[PDB]
């Protein structure tokens, strides 16, 4: 019956079937309960959408159309929860936040 | 050659959904693929440990919800739990 996919059944963009296959073959459990890839794909899609929206906002404030890893770093480090999630994570070609300590300024 | 899979078309679909004027570079796509794989590994490992602690041999959406409550910080975890519950409800209500 035309073989509609599970992501369109769940109304997602991230693949339910590929996430199910990676959960099955990734040596996590004996069984996968078939609603777990839907939840996983939804959580991954939400986190991707939040990061991409903040990075696109940073690129728009930087007057750039395209997102570079600097925009991803500026999106992640300016958010407390995103920086808590990726505290031990290095983003390549992302740089650092502009931050000079207040004592080092003149006068 | 050998067909290596990624999340590039999926992240691009999400990006064109939330920003239908804004492109992305190859390096930023590599960052996004690494992010999705890392968070997948974290949530799946936490759900695997949660299933192993309670003498369960399956991973259900309850294990994934509890893992999302564990790794993710507060409002991030709350909105991710809302998104996952909405998706599982839509998947169950529609075959």
């Amino acid at each position, epitope marked *: 019956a035309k073989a509609k996919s599970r992501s369109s059944r769940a109304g997602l963009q991230f693949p339910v079937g590929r996430v199910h296959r990676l959960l099955r073959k990734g040596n996590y459990a004996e069984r996968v309960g078939a609603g777990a890839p839907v939840y996983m794909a939804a959580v991954l899609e939400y986190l991707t959408a939040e990061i991409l929206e903040l990075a696109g906002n940073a690129a728009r404030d930087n007057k750039k159309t395209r997102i570079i890893p600097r925009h991803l770093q500026l999106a992640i480090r300016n958010d407390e929860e995103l920086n808590k999630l990726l505290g031990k994570v290095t983003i390549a070609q992302g740089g650092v936040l502009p931050n000079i300590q207040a004592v080092l300024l003149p006068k | 050659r050998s067909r290596k899979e990624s999340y590039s078309i999926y992240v691009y679909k999400v990006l064109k959904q939330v920003h239908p004027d804004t492109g992305i570079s190859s390096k930023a796509m590599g960052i996004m693929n690494s992010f999705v794989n890392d968070i997948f590994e974290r949530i799946a490992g936490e759900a695997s440990r949660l299933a192993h602690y309670n003498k369960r041999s399956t991973i259900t959406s309850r294990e994934i919800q509890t893992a999302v409550r564990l790794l993710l910080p507060g*409002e991030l975890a709350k909105h991710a739990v809302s998104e996952g519950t909405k998706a599982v409800t839509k998947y169950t209500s529609s075959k």
Partner: single-chain antibody
Amino acid sequence: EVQLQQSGPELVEPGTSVKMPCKASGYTFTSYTIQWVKQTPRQGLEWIGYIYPYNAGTKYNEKFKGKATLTSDKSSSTVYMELSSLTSEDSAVYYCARKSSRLRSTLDYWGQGTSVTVSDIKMTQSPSSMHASLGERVTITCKASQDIRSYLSWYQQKPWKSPKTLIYYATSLADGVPSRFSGSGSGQDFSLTINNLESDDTATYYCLQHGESPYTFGSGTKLEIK
């Protein structure tokens, strides 16, 4: 748990400056922005700006740029608001509200508001004022001038009280709000539905967009029962 303590009313002479405290408790203070909303009976609610205590990040409305100054003090968990060069049109109630840095999140918990007396995208709400019975259905429209990605919230305000968050993300219910209220719509067309009425529902209902950089409230509907 979560509360935003605000000071009493101010009787200020014009041309001076006034400080406003927003002492906060019950949550991790640095992880949530504090927004400031001004409320006059002639222009309704107007979003002024916000402070992020994580990086002390400011953002102001264009009509309040320079006139308003936001500061944060993380030691006492306090947010300060400065108004300088007080024009006679400053007699208004000022609320400070908590809002997470997540885009889906809204102004969930509000302060009591300080009454100060001097001595973009436009939300169109179709019913200005309507009458409903004790068990009728209420439908309120919030037609938007531009497009927003479902970033609309519905608030209920009693007379002489702080607004109460009903609906966030245009469909999701707030914490503690009963399931009688139901939000619907997306894009430019939104609606709030009250299922069955009580005597509590005599209030003014507003819709706020936060999909773009200037946040805009709606005109508001006055709903009174019997």
